[PDB]
Amino acid sequence: AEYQNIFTRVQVRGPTDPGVELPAADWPRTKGATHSWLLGKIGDAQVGPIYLGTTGVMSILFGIVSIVIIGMNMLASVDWSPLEFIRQFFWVALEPPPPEYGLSLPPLNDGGWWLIAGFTLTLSVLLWFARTYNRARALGLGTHVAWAFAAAIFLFLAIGFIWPVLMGSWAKSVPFGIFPHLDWTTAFSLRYGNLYYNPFHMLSIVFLFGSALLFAMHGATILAAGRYNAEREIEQITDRGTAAERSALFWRWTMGFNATMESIHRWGYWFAILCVITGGIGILLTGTVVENWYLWGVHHGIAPEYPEFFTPAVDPAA
Amino acid sequence: MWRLWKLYDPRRVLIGIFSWLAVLALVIHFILLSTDRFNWVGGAAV
Amino acid sequence: MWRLWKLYDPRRVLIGIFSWLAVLALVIHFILLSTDRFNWVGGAAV
Amino acid sequence: MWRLWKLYDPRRVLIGIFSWLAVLALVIHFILLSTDRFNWVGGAAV
Amino acid sequence: MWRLWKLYDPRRVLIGIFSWLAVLALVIHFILLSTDRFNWVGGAAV
Amino acid sequence: MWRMWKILDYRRTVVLAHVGMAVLALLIHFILLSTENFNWLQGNPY
Amino acid sequence: MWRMWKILDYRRTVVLAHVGMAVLALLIHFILLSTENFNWLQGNPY
Amino acid sequence: MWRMWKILDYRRTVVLAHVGMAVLALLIHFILLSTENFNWLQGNPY
Amino acid sequence: LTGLSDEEAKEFHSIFMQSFLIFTAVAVVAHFLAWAWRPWIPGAEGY
Amino acid sequence: LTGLSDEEAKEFHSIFMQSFLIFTAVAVVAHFLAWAWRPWIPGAEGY
Amino acid sequence: MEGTGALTDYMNVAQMTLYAFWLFLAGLIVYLRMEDKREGYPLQAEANENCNRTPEKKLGFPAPPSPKVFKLADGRSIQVPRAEKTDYELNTQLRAEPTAPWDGAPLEPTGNPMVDGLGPAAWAKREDEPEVTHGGKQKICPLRVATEFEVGMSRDVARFWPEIDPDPRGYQVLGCDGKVAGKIVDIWVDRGELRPMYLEMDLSGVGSSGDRVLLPINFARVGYDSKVRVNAITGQQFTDVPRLREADRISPQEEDFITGYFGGGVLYAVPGRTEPFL
Amino acid sequence: NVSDEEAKEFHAMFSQAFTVYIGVAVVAHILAWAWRPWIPGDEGF
Amino acid sequence: NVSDEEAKEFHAMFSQAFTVYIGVAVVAHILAWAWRPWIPGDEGF
Amino acid sequence: AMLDFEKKYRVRGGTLLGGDLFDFWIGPFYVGIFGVLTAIFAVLGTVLIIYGASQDTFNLWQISIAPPDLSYGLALAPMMEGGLWQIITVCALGAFITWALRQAEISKKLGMGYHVPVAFAVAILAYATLVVFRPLLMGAWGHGFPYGILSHLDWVSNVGYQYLHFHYNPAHMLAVTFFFTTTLALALHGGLILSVTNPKKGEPVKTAEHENTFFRDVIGYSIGSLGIHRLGLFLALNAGFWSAVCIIISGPFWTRGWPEWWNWWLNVPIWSWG
């Protein structure tokens, strides 16, 4: 019977926080900020205010146009039926151009809407990167969050823009839909011979699994050391308390080595961005310098060989 | 029209314009390359 | 050689040796069970 | 142009250049290997 | 050249060298075992 | 109307108009490019 | 060669030697078991 | 060129040079091993 | 407002307009050369 | 031991060179034995 | 193997790009490992750990980097690892005796480990000046001096369903053995994270009604029966909880003192907690 | 650090085990070669 | 921070190691060229 | 050797079993009784894996300890026909369980909560789902995945395609979402801490007020320093838990193509529209 530090029991509500004052060139923040009891159980209860700047507003405008174009094409695909839109919600999409158009501009209803939606969505994420970059600089912080986001954009641009351009056709890019973009993910692996054999896909999984592993470790460690005020990590970095000592000692005694309170966030930071960086690189390599990842794996001696269990099929057209 | 720079930071406007010019120039040059007529490196005939 | 025990705690070497002997005995017995000739319970013929 | 070295740490610039030179030299050497004409270890005939 | 043992801790250099020597020896012996000409326990003819 | 600037902030309104018109101008030019009758680079018969 | 133990701690070297030789002794025994001519448990013709 | 050691830390450079040259030497030996004309282990006709 | 006086704002505005006009002047000459190479306004039958 | 004197550093180096030479000499003897078994430098035609 | 991407008879672009990342990843792991060694290094190798019988400093691989300098907002520069935190750790004389003379043997505390600071009761050396917020206010402060704070995130929840939005002021504090140590008289809040950090309580059940003591919120089980249960320590052991130097302020050093004491009860509160199941 | 006597004591302890370990290893390899030599000829084993 | 005398001593042992490494590397490349030249002719190797 | 602040923490007690017999450190590692058990299990499993490598191939990627055939059912197989995989599986389960029990002793000795062993138990639960629970429900140990770096990737591929489109698995969709969300949360949390404690050069280290302000400026909400670690653990553990759910329902509770599972959505009377 002990407090498990899962939900906050006792809460205190002060005045709503306007935030750290910005330089006298940024737009005023919004004036709407409230407190939610439900969100205070997990963490900070205050919702709002939000900053709306030049890049923030422009990113929303590009993002809305992208979402409207995708949504209207989805709704038109089911003959404007809201009932069929709900029924087919996971299946509808905005389809990329067919392969015949290459990298040229296709007609609106033959991949043109996809290219416009992709362009405006790319602009919105690029402007959102600048928005995240400027907010960190305005408060005098480092731009680590912005560059972590830029790593995510790299995979977003590699999958949807850079790799299709290298392949010479917009058709290879991914449709704007839920199940259709899962179909693209599977068809990508089928087309290029089991993307499991892509080494950068393996590495991207290493850091994806390692990110969940690291946050499970770090999240549990901080919650386990929450008795000693471990969640106050800034103070524990500039002034090492016993929580940082116990957290470091917990993992040292467990697996022989440990990080610091600051350095575990570097580990988590790099694991998250390496997942997305290696993923983007692996997508760029396939189709461009590797045709069949399994045959590439056989060429490098990594494909296992299985003993006979059945009578092998022989290609009748071979 | 000189009162703009009283209202707006001259530096932040310049980055805004440069980013707009860089993005627009790249997009226009890319669109021309996609065409079968203005693709100068492809050397297509009219 | 009795001076080795002025360097290593008797308990820690006993745990180390017993762990090594336990692991080694299991591996060899298991390796023999893998081979048909020395799989005594398997009862293969020579 | 010597004023550049008061703006930037000489050590930091040299590491940046040397890393740039190392990566670029590796890239060009491997770019030549990828080509049929300039692959010296492959012994291709022009 | 003897100053190397003043700048560096000799213990850390010896471990560094022996780590390289052990790893390199393992790599080379394994590479030979992977070939057919030099795989001695494989016993392949020339 | 000159009183519009006592309700709306002129500094923010000018920025909103410029980024807003940038999105609209890009969208319309792209739509025309994605049509047969008004793609001036493709030059289809009208 | 007793001067070695003024540089390298004898107590930690012995443990390092035993664990390291354990891995090597197992590794070499397993290498022989992989071969045809030196797997004493399989007893293939030499 | 001994002023290079006031800008660069000599102790750090020597360790980095050895590791960097280990990487480069292993790479080039392995490049020759991946070729057919310079794989000395396979011994293909030249 | 920003930390610029009238003289600073007017000094920036003149250079901004000169830089804009020179940038536009180069861009116009670039488009004249481009039109001489290949016009981008097709006729009723196309190119 | 980290702050070795010049005399101790010089004597460490002398043993270091002798140990390195003995290690190299054993390796060279090993390579002559290995070369007798199967040479690793092929001719123009190969092995 | 022919086609685009080929570099030699065997090497291709996707293979060399992979080895380029292996080199980058190895360098990154070295960098990350060096960042791991900015607190607690070089390692103190006590006399019993070496055949030379003298304490030594161990760096490890990779060796610790150069010290890091943090610029603080108040106008200070602190170099990490801090000199005084290391100096304190290597100069204090522990009131504990190792169970066996060899290295790696656990320490057996001689006196009261909860007040001496051994194991789970240990505290770090921290600054004795109470922290301040960015605005300049006192960071951690009780509700009496921080009147802008009210208990309960939602008034409606705290009013009509007070079980899930409790106000623990006036509750009773129970030790790990059910002893009624005292009664909560105040809540200390962090102006930076807007959270209750401590529950101030009198010691009326085991001492005087005017003696104030701080109970960390993470060591307190605030039940639905107007009770706060402290499984960490016995009710009587509340009398030895470290006291504040100033009645209205708490320093980072004091925070470690208090959380260290309650953490000492994980092993030392009652006999048998330090013993195994079997 | 350690004295000459302690270093010599350790090396005497090391020399005992090294001789026995190398002696068994040498005898083991002589038996192993007598059983099946591991250096193949030009035609193999 | 680091004086001139140490820089001379660092460069002296650096030059010595550089000369020995470069000397062996040159001989190794001559031997490698004597084995199989790595620069193809017009018709190949 | 020990950290300069480690001495005052290396105290006696907190063990679950073994007590004073195994309560000591070897270098940085705490041993305990479960450390001896986890070392015995780890070495035994690894050496058995290396023996299985010796009988097939020493290529690191091609080493494969495959489970027995489905024809053996739940019976223990001969050693070279899946029995070695079964022995290594129980060794791995023993190694993993003793590892978490060792962390519980270390948690108690440091006065920390048992969050880390419990979070690791979710990973153990996912592994036990793959090699015990799902094989048990389907009735044969041969449904487990082989112990090989590249061979178990082929197992994942074929098992995923046994349902013709594993992306349409609803529990798999949820588990992937948690996996993607936790690395997004990790990048945000890792970056935010680094941004505050490593700001633009010259500026001082920022406070917790800057952290809340930054994320409220970007997306309008900030979860706080305590909320993010609860959220990170929540996302990671749900990723672990729903991974076990997605694989446990693949074959014991769903034998058809996963896209066909969504036919219930397509036949909801609210939006049938036909």
Ligand code: BCL
């Ligand atoms: C049959 C399917 C194939 C397969 C085919 C592919 C393909 C194709 C790809 C992957 C990719 C990945 N695969 Mg895979 N993959 C397989 C099996 C697996 C298994 C498993 C256990 O079986 C796992 C764990 C993984 C895991 C992974 C990741 C390591 C990697 C995705 C990283 C990521 O976070 O992207 C998610 C994050 C992003 C895409 C970036 C997001 C950032 C942007 C900016 C978000 C913008 C949001 C936007 C503004 C929101 C509004 C938009 C509008 C509303 C529309 N794959 C099998 C072999 N896989 C990707 C990769 O990197 O390949 C190496 C990839 O392209």
Ligand code: BCL
């Ligand atoms: C009697 C009390 C103790 C005991 C007391 C002592 C004392 C005292 C000493 C030894 C020493 C040794 N003992 Mg003992 N020893 C005992 C009984 C044994 C038994 C037995 C079955 O009875 C064996 C086989 C051994 C074996 C050994 C050797 C490890 C060592 C002697 C060789 C040496 O000098 O290494 C020297 C070689 C090295 C140091 C090289 C280190 C190797 C490194 C680790 C690199 C290997 C890499 C490896 C190949 C990687 C594997 C590949 C992977 C895929 C990566 N001892 C009993 C249990 N023993 C001596 C010793 O350890 O000195 C150092 C020594 O002084």
Ligand code: BCL
């Ligand atoms: C007994 C004495 C020691 C020893 C003592 C020394 C001393 C002293 C020196 C060397 C140096 C060298 N030693 Mg040594 N060295 C030993 C025996 C060897 C053996 C061998 C088979 O026995 C080999 C192959 C080497 C190899 C090498 C090379 C790494 C280097 C050769 C000259 C040089 O500067 O490279 C020329 C090439 C370069 C300088 C650049 C190479 C680029 C590579 C690809 C990456 C390097 C990154 C670079 C260092 C980045 C610097 C950034 C800043 C540090 C931040 N040594 C023994 C073990 N050696 C020298 C050295 O390393 O100086 C730097 C040197 O001063």
Ligand code: BCL
């Ligand atoms: C045809 C292939 C199918 C597919 C078929 C499958 C199959 C089959 C499975 C998954 C599973 C998963 N898939 Mg899928 N999946 C596909 C495409 C994807 C894509 C993508 C981008 O397309 C992604 C992101 C995913 C993601 C996922 C995850 C939800 C899940 C893997 C995580 C997990 O299991 O945690 C669980 C983590 C563990 C089990 C790790 C256990 C940890 C243990 C306890 C500790 C080990 C310690 C170790 C031995 C120590 C080593 C020694 C030291 C290093 C020294 N899949 C494609 C469409 N997918 C798996 C799953 O959910 O099952 C649980 C699964 O079985």
Ligand SMILES: CC[C@H]1c2cc3[nH]c4c(c3C)C(=O)[C@H](C(=O)OC)c4c3nc(cc4[nH]c(cc(n2)[C@@H]1C)c(C(C)=O)c4C)[C@@H](C)[C@@H]3CCC(=O)OC/C=C(/C)CCC[C@H](C)CCC[C@H](C)CCCC(C)C
């Ligand atoms: C390290 C790689 C991982 C990663 C990192 C990462 N992602 C990031 C970041 C980082 C570091 C950010 O900083 C950024 C962010 O904002 O995070 C909170 C972001 C982000 N990652 C996001 C998504 C995302 N990340 C993903 C993945 C990942 N992110 C990786 C796993 C994925 C996946 C798995 O596919 C997704 C979907 C966004 C939430 C955010 C970037 C936001 C953005 O680009 O915004 C602009 C885009 C638009 C489409 C505009 C939307 C506009 C709205 C629709 C307006 C709504 C109308 C109206 C204004 C509302 C009010 C209504 C009125 C009626 C009142």
Ligand SMILES: CC[C@H]1c2cc3[nH]c4c(c3C)C(=O)[C@H](C(=O)OC)c4c3nc(cc4[nH]c(cc(n2)[C@@H]1C)c(C(C)=O)c4C)[C@@H](C)[C@@H]3CCC(=O)OC/C=C(/C)CCC[C@H](C)CCC[C@H](C)CCCC(C)C
């Ligand atoms: C559930 C949420 C995520 C999570 C959490 C998590 N993992 C954890 C923890 C936590 C909280 C720990 O505390 C614990 C730890 O100490 O981490 C450093 C751990 C850990 N997670 C690890 C790995 C790991 N986690 C993974 C996943 C995840 N871990 C989830 C995504 C994966 C994946 C997805 O593949 C791996 C590989 C270890 C680094 C560590 C536990 C190590 C351990 O128990 O080691 C014991 C000693 C050994 C040497 C193991 C030997 C085992 C056998 C005897 C032999 C091998 C058998 C095995 C079946 C071989 C399989 C090979 C093939 C699959 C290639």
Ligand SMILES: COC(C)(C)C/C=C/C(C)=C/C=C/C(C)=C/C=C/C(C)=C/C=C\C=C(C)\C=C\C=C(C)\C=C\C=C(C)\C=C\CC(C)(C)OC
């Ligand atoms: C009717 O609906 C209303 C209006 C009511 C609102 C509803 C909206 C709805 C329901 C929207 C639903 C949206 C959904 C479900 C979207 C799903 C999106 C998914 C899952 C996307 C997943 C992957 C997509 C990717 C990765 C796309 C990548 C595309 C890229 C990167 C495109 C880049 C294109 C560029 C850069 C274009 C350049 C143009 C140039 C000029 C270069 O070409 C010449």
Ligand SMILES: [Fe+3]
């Ligand atoms: Fe954190």
Ligand SMILES: [Mg+2]
């Ligand atoms: Mg589709």
